[PDB]
Amino acid sequence: PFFPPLYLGGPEITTENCEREPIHIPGSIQPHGALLTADGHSGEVLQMSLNAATFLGQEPTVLRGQTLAALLPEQWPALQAALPPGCPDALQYRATLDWPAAGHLSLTVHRVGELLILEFEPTEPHALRNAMFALESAPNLRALAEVATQTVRELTGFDRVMLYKFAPDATGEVIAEARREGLHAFLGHRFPASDIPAQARALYTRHLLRLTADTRAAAVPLDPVLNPQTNAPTPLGGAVLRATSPMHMQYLRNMGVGSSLSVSVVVGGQLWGLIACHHQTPYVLPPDLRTTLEYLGRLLSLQVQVKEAADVAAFRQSLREHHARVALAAAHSLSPHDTLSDPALDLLGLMRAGGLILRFEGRWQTLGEVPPAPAVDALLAWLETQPGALVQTDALGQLWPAGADLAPSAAGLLAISVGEGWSECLVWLRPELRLEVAWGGATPDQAKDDLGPRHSFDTYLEEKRGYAEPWHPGEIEEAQDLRDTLTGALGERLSVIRDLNRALTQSNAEWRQYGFVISHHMQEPVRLISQFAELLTRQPRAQDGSPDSPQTERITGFLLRETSRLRSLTQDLHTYTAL
Amino acid sequence: PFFPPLYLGGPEITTENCEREPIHIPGSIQPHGALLTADGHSGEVLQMSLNAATFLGQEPTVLRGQTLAALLPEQWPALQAALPPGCPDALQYRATLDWPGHLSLTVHRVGELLILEFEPTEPHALRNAMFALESAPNLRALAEVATQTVRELTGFDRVMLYKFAPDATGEVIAEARREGLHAFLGHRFPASDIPAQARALYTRHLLRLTADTRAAAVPLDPVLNPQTNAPTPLGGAVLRATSPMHMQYLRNMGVGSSLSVSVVVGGQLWGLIACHHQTPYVLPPDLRTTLEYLGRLLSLQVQVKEAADVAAFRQSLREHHARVALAAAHSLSPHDTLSDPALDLLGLMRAGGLILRFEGRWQTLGEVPPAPAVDALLAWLETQPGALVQTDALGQLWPAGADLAPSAAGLLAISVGEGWSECLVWLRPELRLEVAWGGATPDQAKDDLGPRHSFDTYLEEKRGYAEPWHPGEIEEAQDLRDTLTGALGERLSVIRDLNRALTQSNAEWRQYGFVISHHMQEPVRLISQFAELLTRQPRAQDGSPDSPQTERITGFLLRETSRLRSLTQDLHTYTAL
Ligand SMILES: C=CC1=C(C)/C(=C/C2=[NH+]C(=C\c3[nH]c(/C=C4\NC(=O)[C@@H](C)\C4=C/C)c(C)c3CCC(=O)O)/C(CCC(=O)O)=C2C)NC1=O
Ligand SMILES: C=CC1=C(C)/C(=C/C2=[NH+]C(=C\c3[nH]c(/C=C4\NC(=O)[C@@H](C)\C4=C/C)c(C)c3CCC(=O)O)/C(CCC(=O)O)=C2C)NC1=O
């Protein structure tokens, strides 16, 4: 949430509270035109710029309290047709006028809710068509970048044109350039995340072009300053004459620039880069030449998509035979440890790494160049806390500070999680390499020291330690193809272990059956002998001749049935053991 | 492989051999310009059109055997700079000339040859059009804004945005026309009308036209290339003469002038912007350029609006997604979580019948076909190679299950894992379908030798068709698939541990089964060896039996009574364990 503006009452903006700044509501314009705000229905003038009286050529008492029907006889009914109520504020309408005083004026109109903004500017071969075909025929991405910068400098006649590109970590890098002879080179120089605040990145995805005609210019405000309808500051998001933030104005003065111009490159609802332009002297570009730039904004935004997709397709043509066998093996494998650790597939050459870690079942077997054993278990605990399905890093020292000492063995890391929860995984490791980064001006740590912008824009060398070979984007697309084959083959790996679990229940069915029957079928004969031991006590106690005394061998003939009981038992005990 | 052309010696083209036709090598041009071919290095003229003598204004003996340095004083060194040797043939160069009226020149390089084309030449429309498309709400709405804008600039009779299905049949999705004319809107068209080599060409080159349908083709002399002794390729030629097949097709339709612009999304042909005019009509080259911007601007804006339609549809089914994904990730029993009518896994996909197959038992829910036919269907899915099967008509793909139409017409299938071991199937019932075909149906396209006469509304009754799947539903389904295959990792982690516990129980059976069996053999021998004592002493007068010692004999079987006492205790414990 941003702070209120200066005219209403707000704090002075420094380096601490830059993220919260009213950029889109300056309440002022740059002095090479005039501004009028009007009702969406009536057409009555509500606000004016102070210089509008001179720029049009009427008294300011006349213009205030006047319908647009008076000013624009032809334009007014055609303007209402183009911009109906309840439309996106990004939609613009442009028309040329014949004003007798000024000569020729170019008019721009857009609708912010229940208000109509108006902007006025002075106005007057096959270049674009030849440029279009030049981009759609460029071989690679670096080559496309070169063709853009050259072409833009030709049309515009600027001092310096450069294609600026954002990293996924929101830090800039100049990737192409074309300059006037006898000047500095800004090529390669990386730049902080602090220079471009986050709300500006939010704006530049919506509106696509802005400029500054003069850096040492004074802002011309509006009267009345606040909107009559809402009693709030008037929004100037889609305004071309939106006055630049006083912060950024100071930044270009120290650089030595008079005129700025940028065009936002947008890929799939995201800010991919900028086409930034500098001029040493104050300079104004005609509106009919700004239009030509806006086509090159949209043409590039399409052509970036194609060339980046052709680079990854070309890289994944070299590693074709090396892919085919790896994918064929890790799909029919039931033993993951004794197929993927085999140095006939060389699963360190596919990803061009030093150390590979394979984790399946519950034993981390090793291959290549790996760190000491206790530190590996410290690393695998850190991956289980990580939420995704793939972990990609070039510097491990920043993400995990405990493993900053493991730099010589493992600096870069690529990780896959087959399944979910990091139970089974694969890890690639790249060794440490010497790294020197050329920062334009100052490093990101030195950006928060000064109260305003930095003075120096020279080449600065920083020694970075804990950095490996950065991963090619083709390798990560390769890796995710491997992941989904190992998770796909998991379906056949469960289909077997269920069948082995079914066979063990059959063996447990035998143990409980034989363990119960034989135990209780033993209890009767052993009681039968012990109850015949009762007979062996009944006879010789009396010591006299019993009526069983003759048939004592028939009594023995009765325990002969009992001897044959244990005889049949001991035979059955050996058979059930054998199974 | 295409047949050789007519001038060299080839067969007459009919409906049978349309797929094999030399389209890109006609050896002729349309007669509203002139053509010159030249060496890539020397600049000597090698071939000419027959009408080039009149169109430029020199004798044809003069022009043949002349350098380009003579003709173009300014252009020649700037032309060589723009097109270096070994460049894509798609790259073009254009320049305006002052010929004593005005000529517009177009040049491109096919290998070791330089093609040249000549054509007669002379506010904020485009800029306002650009912002109109980038502000359209939906895809249908964007289509409307394109057609209107194109008709305004060009002044054509009929403009229509044409769109291909993934099965390569056309459908007109937007239109704008002159008042008092037929409406072609909605009408579907066959795969036969646009051959496959033309679809291969239109991905490379993006614009072509026909200025007159009843025009005679003006050929080249010499007809064959001097360098290679082969026909001269005219792929990237604007004045490439139209195929005699397609020329007949527009005559029966009642069209004089054709123009189309190829829409290209991600290296694929998405659609066309087709234009018709009843009268012969020529468009100036400076107005063709304006169309070519609208070709590229649309190709970007199609991508955005289609992605916003799927994002909007998958906002309604947000709470209905969240619970389903949360349950089918922690589930260990798939059958007794997903068949539960508290998640309603027939409402997510708006279907009649759901089949769940896990372990090896197909439980049913909703409206399902008879039981033996289900096993016939699951055998057909196992032969299918992919990870998702998507169909609206099952009758065409699987002819054996054409009788199962009332229960199952449409099908969506997922394979959790691989090999169709475990799956999910959705089924939609049969619905009445009437399709409006423009002219004739695809079966009636192969009957006639040439093009069809009728272009009127034709009604065909189609049976075996359900509600066609919304593309947002298929993106929803593939999100479910990867959660069920993802949760499979935890489902194996458990069944191994249960397999470890059953080996412990098998270790007990083999231990107790061996020991007790052999430790029983001794006591039973001890009783049988005491039966030996019972044979030795059947009378008291023997050396062993004394009346006091008979209770010590009983004292010896007291050791045997304590044997079975210790046994019966051990028999109850090993039963419990
Ligand atoms: C050599 C390379 C190079 C870089 C790295 C670069 C960055 C850059 N900043 C931009 C915008 C803004 N930056 C800040 C704030 C700060 N600027 C800082 O550096 C510190 C002092 C700071 C705050 C702590 C603000 C308020 C704005 C919005 C201004 C507005 O539109 O009202 C723009 C777009 C403007 C344009 O087109 O030139 C770019 C491209 N300009 C270059 O040409
Ligand atoms: C009302 C809707 C509508 C439809 C459905 C339609 C189709 C269509 N056919 C096209 C192309 C070709 N067709 C054929 C051949 C055949 N044509 C048939 O119908 C049968 C007889 C046949 C072979 C068996 C050939 C050789 C070509 C390549 C021409 C060349 O480049 O030389 C084009 C692009 C041309 C253009 O801009 O008009 C389209 C868009 N034209 C429409 O406006």
UniProtKB/Swiss-Prot annotation, chain A:
E.C. number: 2.7.13.3
Catalyses which reaction(s): ATP + protein L-histidine = ADP + protein N-phospho-L-histidine
Domain GAF: 140-304
Intrachain disulfide bonds: none
GO biological process, alphabetically ordered: detection of visible light; osmosensory signaling via phosphorelay pathway; regulation of DNA-templated transcription
Domain PAS: residue ranges: 20-88
Processing after translation: Contains one covalently linked tetrapyrrole chromophore. Lacks the cysteine conserved in plant phytochromes (at the position of Met-247) that binds chromophore. An engineered sequence used for X-ray crystallography forms a thioether link to biliverdin through Cys-18. The natural sequence can bind phycocyanobilin and phytochromobilin in vitro, but the identity of the natural chromophore is unknown.
Enzyme class: transferase
Molecular function GO terms recorded: ATP binding; identical protein binding; phosphorelay response regulator activity; phosphorelay sensor kinase activity; photoreceptor activity; protein kinase activator activity
Signal peptide: none
Binding of a tetrapyrrole, residues: C18
Phosphohistidine found at: H520
KW Metal-binding (keyword) present: no
Result for mutant: M247A: Binds PCB (in vitro), but difference spectrum is altered
Keywords recorded for this protein, A-Z: ATP-binding, Chromophore, Kinase, Nucleotide-binding, Phosphoprotein, Photoreceptor protein, Receptor, Sensory transduction, Transferase
Region (Chromophore binding domain): 89-492
Statement: the UniProt record of this protein carries the keyword Protease: no
Family: In the N-terminal section; belongs to the phytochrome family.
Physiological role: Photoreceptor which exists in two forms that are reversibly interconvertible by light: the R form that absorbs maximally in the red region of the spectrum and the FR form that absorbs maximally in the far-red region. Also has a slight blue shift for the far-red maximum. Could also absorb green light. May participate in regulating pigment synthesis like the carotenoid deinoxanthin which could protect the bacterium from intense visible light.
Protein name as catalogued: Bacteriophytochrome
Species the sequence originates in: Deinococcus radiodurans (strain ATCC 13939 / DSM 20539 / JCM 16871 / CCUG 27074 / LMG 4051 / NBRC 15346 / NCIMB 9279 / VKM B-1422 / R1)
Species lineage: Bacteria, Thermotogati, Deinococcota, Deinococci, Deinococcales
